[PDB]
């Protein structure tokens, strides 16, 4: 679908726009591809991702964090942020540099908004200067404009000692195309 998890990377809130990058050709009810976006995360911010095949290649709808990812028994999550709680190794309730999954997590920033993730568009948490993520959030259910939404918001720490927002989003999309494709 179009449900997502994102980080505020430059420290002024998670922000979204209408799509214009790839939108000069739109997918249709028989042409296979990715579900047609009308809005997306603006390039100062990034999506939280993981290759579930461990080679650092994002291609499937579970590889985005969001309500279409699964928990450690194979169940879908009720809220995509809570799927991060399976990844804490020691039970301190932070995702930090001592957890194995900290190296497996990545962040995606797409400048062309084509819905495919390519290798230059990805960041590891250490290359992104992240030190920890909090497994704690509040429900905010806030509009972001252009049909986009922020459901829930938590927090993260940078290696430079700055702290910033992270959260669960709904991104704007074509409703019929989002039923022809997942």
Structure tokens that stand for 181 in this block: 């494709």
Q: Which is nearer to Ca ion, 133 or 177 (CB)?
A: 133
Site for Ca ion in 119-158 (CB under 5 A): none
Residue 68 binding Ca ion, by CB under 5 A: no
Residue 168 binding Ca ion, by CB under 5 A: yes
Q: How far is CA 125 from the centre of its chain?
A: 14
Structure tokens that stand for 87 in this block: 């990844």
- Pick the binder of Ca ion from 35, 40, 64, 67 (CB under 5 A): 67
Structure tokens that stand for 119 in this block: 């290798």
> Least distance (Å) from Ca ion to the CB of residue 174?
19
Q: Which is nearer to Ca ion, 134 or 174 (CB)?
A: 134
Part of the chain binding Ca ion (CB under 5 A), chosen from 18-26, 52-60, 69-77, 142-150: 52-60
Part of the chain binding Ca ion (CB under 5 A), chosen from 21-29, 37-45, 122-130, 137-145: 37-45
Do residues 147 and 39 touch, judged by C-beta distance below 8 A? yes
Q: Which is nearer to Ca ion, 3 or 107 (CB)?
A: 3
Residue 86 binding Ca ion, by CB under 5 A: no
Do residues 81 and 152 touch, judged by C-beta distance below 8 A? yes
Q: List Cα–Cα distances, 41 to 18, 37, 172, in angstroms.
A: 9, 11, 10
Structure tokens that stand for 63 in this block: 């590889």
For residue 16, the SS3 value is strand
Do residues 166 and 156 touch, judged by C-beta distance below 8 A? yes
**Binding positions for Ca ion, rule: CB under 5 A:** 3, 8, 10, 12, 15, 44-45, 51, 53, 57, 59, 67, 80, 88, 90, 92, 96, 99, 110, 112, 114, 168
């Amino acid at each position: 679908g179009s449900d997502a998890l994102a980080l505020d990377l430059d420290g002024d809130g998670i922000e979204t726009v209408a799509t214009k990058g790839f939108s000069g050709s739109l997918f249709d009810h028989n042409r296979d591809g990715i579900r047609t976006a009308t809005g997306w995360v603006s390039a100062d911010d990034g999506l939280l991702v993981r290759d579930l095949n461990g080679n650092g290649i994002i291609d499937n709808g579970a590889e985005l964090f969001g309500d279409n990812t699964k928990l450690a028994d194979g169940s879908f999550a009720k809220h995509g942020y809570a799927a991060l709680a399976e990844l804490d190794s020691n039970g301190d309730n932070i995702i930090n540099a001592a957890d194995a999954a900290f190296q497996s997590l990545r962040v995606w920033q797409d400048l062309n908004q084509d819905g495919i993730s390519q290798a230059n568009e990805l960041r590891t948490l250490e290359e992104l200067g992240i030190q920890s993520l909090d497994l704690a959030y509040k429900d905010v259910n806030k509009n972001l404009g252009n049909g986009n939404t922020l459901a829930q918001q938590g927090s993260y720490t940078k290696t430079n000692g700055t702290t910033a927002k992270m959260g669960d989003l709904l991104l704007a999309a074509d409703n019929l195309h989002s039923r022809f494709l997942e």
